[PDB]
Amino acid sequence: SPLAAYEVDDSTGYLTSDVGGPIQDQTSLKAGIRGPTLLEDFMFRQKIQHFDHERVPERAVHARGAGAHGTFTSYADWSNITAASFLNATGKQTPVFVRFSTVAGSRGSADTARDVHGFATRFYTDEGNFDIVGNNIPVFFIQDAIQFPDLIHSVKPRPDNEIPQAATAHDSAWDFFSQQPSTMHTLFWAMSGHGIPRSYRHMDGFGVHTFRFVKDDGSSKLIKWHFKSRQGKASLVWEEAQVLSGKNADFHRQDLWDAIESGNGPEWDVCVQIVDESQAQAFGFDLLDPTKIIPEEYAPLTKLGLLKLDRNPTNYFAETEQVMFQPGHIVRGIDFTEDPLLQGRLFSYLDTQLNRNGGPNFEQLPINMPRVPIHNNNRDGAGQMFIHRNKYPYTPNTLNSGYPRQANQNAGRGFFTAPGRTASGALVREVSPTFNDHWSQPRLFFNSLTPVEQQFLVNAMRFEISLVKSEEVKKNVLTQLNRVSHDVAVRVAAAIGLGAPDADDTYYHNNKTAGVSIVGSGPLPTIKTLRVGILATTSESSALDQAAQLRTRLEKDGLVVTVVAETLREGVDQTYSTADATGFDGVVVVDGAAALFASTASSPLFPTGRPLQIFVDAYRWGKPVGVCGGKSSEVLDAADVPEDGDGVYSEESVDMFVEEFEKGLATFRFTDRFALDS
Amino acid sequence: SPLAAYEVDDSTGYLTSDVGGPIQDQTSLKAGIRGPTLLEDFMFRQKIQHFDHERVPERAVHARGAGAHGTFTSYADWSNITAASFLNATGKQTPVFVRFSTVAGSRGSADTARDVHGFATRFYTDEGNFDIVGNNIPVFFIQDAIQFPDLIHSVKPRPDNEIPQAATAHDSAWDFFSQQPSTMHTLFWAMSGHGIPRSYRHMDGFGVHTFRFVKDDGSSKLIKWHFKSRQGKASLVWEEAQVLSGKNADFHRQDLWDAIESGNGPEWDVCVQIVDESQAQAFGFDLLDPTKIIPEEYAPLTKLGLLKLDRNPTNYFAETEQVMFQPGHIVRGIDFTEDPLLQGRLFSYLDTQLNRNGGPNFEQLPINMPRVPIHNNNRDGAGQMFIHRNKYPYTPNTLNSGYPRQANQNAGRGFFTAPGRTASGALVREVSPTFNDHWSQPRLFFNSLTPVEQQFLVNAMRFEISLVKSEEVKKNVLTQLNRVSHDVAVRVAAAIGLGAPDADDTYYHNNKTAGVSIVGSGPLPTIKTLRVGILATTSESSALDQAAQLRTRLEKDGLVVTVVAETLREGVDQTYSTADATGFDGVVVVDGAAALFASTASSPLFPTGRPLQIFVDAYRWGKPVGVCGGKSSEVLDAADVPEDGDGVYSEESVDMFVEEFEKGLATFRFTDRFALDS
Amino acid sequence: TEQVMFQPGHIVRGIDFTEDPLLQGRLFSYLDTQLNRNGGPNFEQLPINMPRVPIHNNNRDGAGQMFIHRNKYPYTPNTLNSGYPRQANQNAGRGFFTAPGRTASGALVREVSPTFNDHWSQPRLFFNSLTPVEQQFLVNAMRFEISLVKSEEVKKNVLTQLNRVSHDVAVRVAAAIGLGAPDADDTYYHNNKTAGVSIVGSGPLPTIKTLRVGILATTSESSALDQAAQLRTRLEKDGLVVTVVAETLREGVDQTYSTADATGFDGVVVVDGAAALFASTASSPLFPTGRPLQIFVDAYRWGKPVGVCGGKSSEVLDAADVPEDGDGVYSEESVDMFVEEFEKGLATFRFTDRFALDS
Ligand code: HDD
Ligand code: HDD
Ligand SMILES: [Ca+2]
Ligand SMILES: [Ca+2]
Ligand SMILES: [Ca+2]
């Protein structure tokens, strides 16, 4: 913790200026008790000036996000495939910092927007900082970095009025998607449940690009990075995400914070797919193309180590806001590929930190510093924090005895470009013909989802495209969807009253791939941290008694339990007024409370119908719901919830109720409650 | 447009660099067709560098906002009270730019957060730019500018985890409120409907501070600025505001945008209260105190002129984002007072623009430029756009013949300090004792609300304080509330399971004041722009017929009509999937659509129960609802809405339906549907 | 050095400001200007600017933020951080406080105090307090600068102001620029003087340590370099910085004639073994024509102590047109006697009898 050396404690002591002079900061200096404020009030000005300059530009993308500290532990000595020092011994531990994010919204936008999500991991290795700046979706919208402002301008708010915030549901985005068909693969992922994850802990991370692992002998293999969640994969449903955006814009950052504080810090297996250089085009697409995945059937995952997040930042601004990641932060044993999206990224991340930091010495901020000595001839610049002793900062020199020395493949453990890499041909601004198949892999992805997942994706597209005003853009969108799947274009067209174009089967096929479905990936492996809302009443002393007994039983198994009542008191966490179904992964009514759910309910302490609305919403959104007490039928009738439904629980016995209700939590969503196209 | 001279047209022509060289920007230059990108690719780098640097720091407060162009027109020659040139002739027109905003949220946060709102107006006068940087609430939280960072730190997200976004519902804010009693007045306004306005058009603006009008003879009078909405006052209900925050984060900016495009540009009467210098302490409080209003019974409003917003910006960034308001932008005829809040603001706004603009020449941005010539000896600085001819930029000079000439009270129409102003006494960092009554005016305000408005305010406080984790903070909050009103403290305490402290009647009184109530300000004066959702179906050709007839008669009265059905087609604006009750001011079901409202209604095209939920939500939130066509009983029964309810409409005849329904839209909210504490 | 950011706003308990209107505005400027230099608000965190005591305040964020603040309730007043940091003032925490006797009275004005209006008496006090040669130098600095002003009207306006200080100054300055001085205006003329403002009159320097002595020698003569080495040891003993100069470097020789100039020395000594370099027909590809003699002559003309060490002085001094009996001109055979006299000269520092006076 270079973070702990820079920590500042203010738990005792008298207020000082920034130069250590004790002062006051509550009243301005004035000429007389009702007089004007004086220019000589240095206390006033130092304080306001600091306030007035507190903000810094938000990131150009991924502005909305949150971070945590942890550790990476290697499972083996990986010398045989990479020279990377953080992977060179069983059990070797490296500190990490991770930031998760959306792409499109500004700071302050809602966590539960539909979007691609960032998953950026810094490894503070003993041979330098290494960053993997990935996303929760393994493919990207575009095939060349020069198009990135085009993609981003199209998805961000229309620039006359700056509407809409954090959403692709507008003409410009679908105009771009429909004119730039490379977008189809990422679009399909973003329109699935991968666009609205349950939490940062319930998504995967991917490096997206093919990279190289380079051995000390100089041989190389091609790799893709996969961070596979140990919490399982899980999504919201859209109608739930929308309400969550309003009720709790901070949902994902709160979830992450709380999991870490409770001792449930999330984990991922850090994995690679590893293939030979000769396989760059063996799989029916080009490994230089970031719109393509390698099916796991062609290349299995190898598990390199464990990533665990287990500590929250001390100061959000200083750590999370100021962390400045770069794919250029590379270490010996890793190399780039000629992926034209990766290639341009290298430029952008060094440049953009000048905007954020306002000066060139951004690598000296505590969160950006390495954990090894720095020896170089970089000097001066605004905000220079070091006092360099070497007064001959040039190479070659004799007056500093030739130091710092050059590092390279054979000296000082230098980074070196993989020596088998070559280039040949004309200097061109031309797209490789090997990149031209934009529709096959979207179809592979779509084929690999379950029927209800396919319906959710169609429904997401129906939602967004129905909000596009241009009839031409809508037609063009159907044209592109039709090339992936005639069925998708037909079902989407039905919602927007246009006809789909005739089937064009060039890229149609029936193939599937493992591991891309959320709903298909079986029950969650753990239910720790999941949220249960127990709906109770201060009316009946039996209701708070039953709530307390359920609480014990659920908290035993690591669930986070919230007892809801009309008013706060001992045992009650939340009022009906502040409660919502978006707040819980499952809801239980204690039978003691059945009168609150009648249609003539009414209280000055919460909005009309709130108790029942929580229960109904939770049911309609596919959550496990139940009534505990043995007079269940009255609440279930008021809800129009069938007692015999999957994921509906009714028991008098607390112990039997809990046992089945917990199986429901693992199932997580009951997908039989959602209507499917015929 | 004033700013037409700076417009750039890209409706034709070939892509160029910033220096006019024709280029391409879709493919990177590579060493071979699958090769690495080249450093000599200047096309790539100039485009990506611009992208990398697009963002600028958000405003330190009022980051989330929106703007429009307009005109101010004077109603008279106001020479007899002020020298101000924009007020010197009946009918005199001056261009304006207004930005509206929330206070606490970052720039992507929801418009319908509970907050104080900004209302900042620039008058581009023939004697310089004059800015009135106001709020929609006439009193401010604190009495000294030096305390602003304390207020804002406490209300903004907790700095460890940056939670929660755009909300005072957390411990730090209520800690500050309870330890700093000056906050009570603004707190009561923010917890009333004024904290969740229906639109920027349905709120007032206030300068907050006492200022001075100064005549050409040097005599002065004390003024408060009031911008009084011609659209009337209106608020959301909290439970509505919360869902709206998710469903449409852009609600207020969209409402303003749309009103201007439809030729319904909003208007305010720009008014002043005018009192003599001798009345600074005549009204039982100190006019230098920004936590106090002057009750209209003691000083009436004088209408000075009309503010009309009628033109949307061309580019949001360039106009809205870059507008840099200053209370320091003052003109001859106006002066400051020794209000210690105002005094410190004068420093802050000049300083903070350096952060935003990144250099000192921010007054040269098109939106910030004046509409008259500039003559001064300000020179150089980053981003200097002028080429100054005068090569002797010093005073006094002979080598530029003594130009520019000094302007003052007697020459060149210079600004001048009101010459009757004086100071006397010790140089002190002390609060005037005349500022010490923090509680009477909060009580005056509370007393001037209707019973249901009082309930809504109590309920806002119950909501927020129930989320405060510290029992000590909650206790301290009740202590302060109790000094305003024992009844308030009792009613709030009931939701959080504490007892309120014994009554302390030092500041209790029964006085009321006119015009601070929303509910009490009679029906809206116009219903133009209000939104009616018509819930129809494609399953019956008669329903769409009914909807079309309803649309014709409602549009004739300038309402914005959305017809909602399962799918889009001619006549249908929105699908049930995208529709929500938060999108309408009133909801009509056409009786041809009754089958969608049954509890077994289901479709793959929208979430279960969505048609009925829209109707139920609208009813519960106090909106006029109805069924048109004659067969009303299944819809009203399914919704549990009584046919004889106020603001419930049931007529066979479209004519009669609309005549009654329109009375309901003017009534706006039916307050009898909300329960009151006994 | 480049990053140090000073401010008169950096004040401590026991010091306070006055209502000097120049000082009052400075307090604003120095806080504001560091934003320009540093490009962000955390300039007090640069090592040179940090205090040597703990910092406890609620300043947060900003570009370049180096601290990680633990207090997550950075507002006052608070209970959630127990009311810390506490307010410091006259009576608690050794706070800064404004001197309590200070007051203000009267109108809010943009007017100059009439008490500020005598612009000329003190300039005259200062001028009166200089020695005659110092007065001449001041006049000569004005004649130099004003003679480069192209505007005839500006020049007249200058003599109008100077004349209000001293008619004599305006006359002597006017003579160089071909204008007539305006007639005497004696409102602010006086004969008063004040101690300690004169440089020339502040006696010999109190130390000559660090002053620079150039020894002009030659590689022609093994004698010349021996004399230079003996001089060097004797001068270095008294903490002077000695530079031996010759045609080319070698052991004992610090600088070539090519790089040397009289501006590099406070005193110049020629060793008499080097006399041949000082002739008018001296010439070498290793230095500009006349360079050795020019160093000596420049040093003499600029008022420095000069001398010849070894016993044979008259060829050098005649080549240079320097009278052997001049004040601050030294001739001795003995190194010890040479240095004893020469060091008196270094303490005198400048021999002002070598500069002409008006009238
Ligand atoms: C040519 C520009 C460009 C391209 C093609 C990309 N990005 Fe990027 N990205 C940026 C330019 C950039 C940036 C403007 O440089 C950002 C904003 C702030 C920063 O540090 O870098 C950024 C931020 C950024 C962040 C946030 C890091 C954080 O939390 O601070 C993530 C996770 C990604 N990007 C991930 C990706 C992935 C997985 C991409 C494709 C595979 C990708 N970006 C393509
Ligand atoms: C001492 C500091 C301070 C104090 C006491 C206040 N403000 Fe302020 N205000 C600022 C410091 C500031 C600022 C940091 O200087 C901002 C942020 C951006 C800007 O241009 O100025 C600002 C912005 C800002 C804006 C946004 C203008 C726009 O849309 O760009 C409004 C409407 C206000 N303020 C209104 C007020 C009112 C009505 C106040 C009390 C009566 C008030 N402020 C007190
Ligand atoms: Ca658009
Ligand atoms: Ca800058
Ligand atoms: Ca808090």
| Torsion of Cα atoms, A287 then A290 then A291 then A295, to 10° | 50
Asked if residue A117 lies in contact with residue A192, where contact means CB atoms within 8 angstroms, the answer is no
Atom of ligand 1 nearest to the CA of A101: 29
Pinpoint the alpha helices (H) of B110-170: 148-155
Topology of domain B527-678, CATH: Rossmann fold (3.40.50)
Measured between beta carbons, the chain A residues lying within 8 angstroms of B59 are 55
Contact C67 A32 (CB under 8 A): no
B157, two tokens: 């997200």
Q: Is B423 helix (H, G, I), strand (E, B) or coil?
A: strand
Q: Which among A17, A49, A107, A243 is the top mutation candidate for probing chain B, defined by the most B β-carbons within 10 Å of its own β-carbon?
A: A107
- Between CA A138 and CA A295 the distance in angstroms is 11
Residues 6+ away with beta carbon under 8 Å from B436: none
Contact B470 C80 (CB under 8 A): yes
Q: Is B195 in the pocket of ligand 2 (CB under 6 A)?
A: no
CA B66, CA B312: separation in Å to the nearest integer? 10
Give the tokens for residue A346: 């290298």
| CA atoms of A619 and A600, how far apart (whole Å) | 21
Q: Count residue pairs from A and C with Cβ separation < 8 A.
A: 215
Distances (CA, A) of B327 to B152, B331, B344: 19, 10, 10
Q: Are B341 and B143 in contact (CB under 8 A)?
A: yes
Please report which ligand is nearest the Cα atom of A102. 1
What single letter denotes the amino acid at residue B413? R
Q: Measured in whole angstroms, how far is the alpha carbon of residue B78 from the centre of its chain?
A: 28
Task: Let me know: does A352 contact A149? Beta carbons within 8 Å.
Answer: no
- Topology (CATH) of C208-359: Rossmann fold (3.40.50)
User: Which contiguous run of DSSP H or E holds residue A47?
Assistant: helix A42-52
Q: Which helix (H) or strand (E) holds B128?
A: strand B128-135
* Sheet architecture: strand order including A30-31: A30-31, B422-428, C103-107
Contact C63 A319 (CB under 8 A): no
Going by the DSSP 8-state scheme, the letter that residue A69 receives in this structure is E
Q: Which atom of ligand 1 is nearest to the CA of A326?
A: 20
In CATH terms, the fold of domain A428-526 is: Hemocyanin, N-terminal domain (1.20.1370)
Give resolution in angstroms.
1.9
B99 annotated to bind ligand? yes
C86 touches chain B (CB under 8 A): no
- Does residue A34 sit at the C interface (CB-CB below 8 Å)? no
- Residues of C within 8 A of B419 (CB-CB) are 107
The answer to whether B114 is annotated as binding is no
CA angle (A138 as vertex; A132, A141 as ends), nearest 5: 105
Cα-based distances in Å from A117 to A105, A112, A194, A266, A292: 11, 10, 9, 17, 18
C27 touches chain B (CB under 8 A): no
* DSSP reduced 3-state for A84: coil
CA distances from C59 to A17, B170, B654, C69, C93 (A): 9, 21, 63, 10, 19
Q: Establish whether B363 is an annotated binding residue.
A: yes
Whether residue B402 contacts residue B390, with contact meaning beta carbons closer than 8 Å, is answered with: no
- Tokens at residue A405, please? 């020395």
The Cα–Cα gap between A116 and A138 comes to 10
Angle (CA) B332 B334 B339, round 5°: 140
Which of A38, A164, A344 shows the shortest C-beta gap to B250? A164
The residue assigned the tokens 């009267």 is: C106
Q: Are A29 and A38 in contact (CB under 8 A)?
A: yes
Side-chain-facing half-sphere of B434: CA atoms under 13 Å: 18
| Cross-strand partners of C107 | B422
Beta bridge partners of C253: C250
What is the CB neighbour count within 10 angstroms for residue B381?
A: 12
Structure tokens at B231: 């659209």
Neighbours of chain C (3+ CB pairs under 8 A): A, B
Distance A346 CA to ligand 1 centre (A): 10
A33's enclosing H/E stretch is none
Structure tokens at C219: 């590689």
- Torsion region of C197: left, alpha or beta (phi above 0 gives left; psi -120 to 50 gives alpha): alpha
Tokens at residue A141, please? 């919208």
Catalytic, B69? Answer no
- The DSSP call for residue B460 is H
DSSP output for A484-495: H-HHHHHHHHHH
Q: In this structure, are residues A234 and A266 in contact, taking their beta carbons and an 8 Å threshold?
A: no
Q: Report how many helices (DSSP H) and strands (DSSP E) chain A contains, helices first.
A: 17, 19
- Please report where in the chains the tokens 């129009």 appear, as a residue: A640
Whether A394 and chain C come into contact, CB under 8 Å, resolves to no
- The residues with which C268 forms a beta bridge, in sequence order, are C214, C306
Instruction: Count other Cβ atoms within 10 Å, centred on residue A522.
Output: 10
* Strand A211-214, strand A220-229: pairing: antiparallel
Whole-number CA gyration radius for chain C = 30
Class of residue A558 by CB neighbours under 10 A (exposed 0-12, middle 13-18, buried 19+): middle
Inter-CA distances, B297 with A93, A193, A667, B206, Å:
73, 59, 65, 18
User: Can you tell me which atom of ligand 2 is nearest the CA of B67?
Assistant: 29
Pick the catalytic residue: B88, B135, B248, B368?
B135
Q: What is the 3-state secondary structure (H, E, C) of B440-470?
A: HHHHHHHHCCCHHHHHHHHHHHHHHHHCCCC
List C-alpha distances in Å: B126 to A20, A316, B86, B88: 48, 47, 7, 11
Tell me phi and psi for residue A149, to 5 degrees: -65, -30
Experimental approach was X-ray
Give A53 to chain C, closest Cα distance, Å: 6
> How far is the C-alpha of A53 from the C-alpha of A61, rounded, in Å?
22
Give the DSSP H/E element, type plus range, for residue C348. Answer: helix C335-348
Return the H-helix or E-strand segment holding B238: helix B238-247
Tell how far CA C269 is from the center of its chain. 25
Token pair in block for residue A497: 């009253």
From A147, A173, A137, A158, select the one nearest A348 (Cα to Cα): A147
End-to-end CA distance of chain C: 47
**What is the C-alpha separation between B591 and B588, in angstroms, rounded?**
9
Distance from the alpha carbon of residue B55 to the mean position of ligand 5, in angstroms:
28
Put simply, the answer to whether C60 touches A23 (Cβ < 8 Å) is no
Which chain A residue has the Cα nearest residue C22?
A: A40
Which ligand 1 atom lies nearest to the CA of residue A290? 41
The first and second tokens of residue B99, run together, are 């930005």
**Residue A297: exposed, middle, or buried by beta-carbon count in 10 A (0-12, 13-18, 19+)?**
exposed
Question: Do A452 and A460 contact (CB within 8 A), yes or no?
Answer: no
The answer to whether the beta carbons of residues B591 and B638 sit under 8 Å apart is no
Residue A449 φ then ψ, to 5°: -85, 160
Active site amino acids of A: 62, 135
**Residues on chain B touching C58 (C-beta within 8 angstroms):** 149-150, 153
Give the Cα separation of B641 and B670 in Å (integer): 13
Contacts of residue A376, Cβ cutoff 8 Å, sequence gap at least 6: A404
CA dist A359 and C40 (Å) reads 8
A261/C contact by beta carbon, under 8 A: no
In the numeric block, the tokens 């755009």 are attached to B166
8-state DSSP, A368: G
Strand B560-565 to B574-575 pairing: parallel
State the burial class of residue C144 (Cβ atoms within 10 Å of its Cβ: 0-12, 13-18, 19+): exposed
A625-628 sheet: strands from edge to edge? A574-575, A560-565, A531-535, A586-590, A625-628, A648-651
Dist CA B37 CA A342 (whole Å): 10
Amino acid letter for position C206: P
Domain limits, chain A: 1-427, 428-526, 527-678
Task: Tell me how far apart the alpha carbons of residues A77 and A304 are, in angstroms, rounded to a whole number.
Answer: 9
Q: Work out the widest C-alpha separation in chain B, in whole angstroms.
A: 91
Integer Cα distance of C284 and A236 in angstroms: 92
CA-CA-CA-CA torsion sign (A371, A375, A378, A383): positive
Distance (Å, whole) CA A391 – CA C315: 47
A positions 447-476 inside 8 Å of B (CB): 455, 459, 462-463, 466-467
Exposed, middle or buried: residue C226 (CB in 10 Å: 0-12, 13-18, 19+)?
middle
Residue C54 CA to residue C72 CA, distance in Å, equals: 18
DSSP state of B497: T
Classify strands B118-125 and B93-101 as parallel, antiparallel or unpaired.
antiparallel
The secondary element (H helix, E strand) that includes residue A320 is none
Asked if B357 contacts B156 with a C-beta cutoff of 8 angstroms, the reply is no
Counting ligands in written order, the one closest to the CA of B357 is 4
Instruction: Please report residues of B whose CB lies closer than 8 A to that of C104.
Output: 423-425, 427
CA distances to C134, C140, C163 from C147, rounded to whole Å, are 20, 10, 17
Q: Does B170 participate in catalysis according to the annotation?
A: no
Rounded to 5°, angle at Cα A148 from A142 and A149: 145
The answer to whether A59 is a known ligand-binding residue is: yes
Using a 6 Å cutoff on CB, does residue B211 contact ligand 2?
no
Please indicate whether, in this complex, the C-beta atoms of B604 and A676 are within 8 angstroms of each other. yes
Ligand nearest to the CA of B291: 2
- Extract the tokens encoding C31: 């806080």
- The neighbouring-strand residues paired with B272 are B225, B302
Between 2.40.180.10, 3.90.226.10, 1.10.3720.10, 3.20.130.10, what CATH number should domain B1-427 receive? 2.40.180.10
From B62, B170, B185, B194, active-site residue: B62
Q: What is the CA radius of gyration of chain A?
A: 28
Q: How far does Cα C334 stand from its chain's mean position?
A: 35
CA-nearest residue, atom 24 of ligand 1: A62
Pick the CATH number of C109-207 from 1.10.486.10, 1.20.1370.20, 1.10.645.10, 1.10.275.10: 1.20.1370.20
Q: Give me the DSSP letters along A466-533.
A: TT---HHHHHHHHHHHHHH-HHHHHHHHHHTT-PPPP--GGG------TT--STTS-S-S--TT-EEE
In eight-state DSSP terms, residue B394 is -
Q: Which residues, 6 or more positions from B314, have their beta carbon under 8 angstroms from its beta carbon? A: A160, B1, B3, B7
Residue whose tokens read 């959306």: A102
Q: Say if residues A485 and A503 touch (Cβ distance below 8 Å).
A: no
Sign of the torsion formed by the C-alpha atoms of C321, C325, C326 and C331: positive
Nearest by Cα to B15 from B54, B49, B46: B46
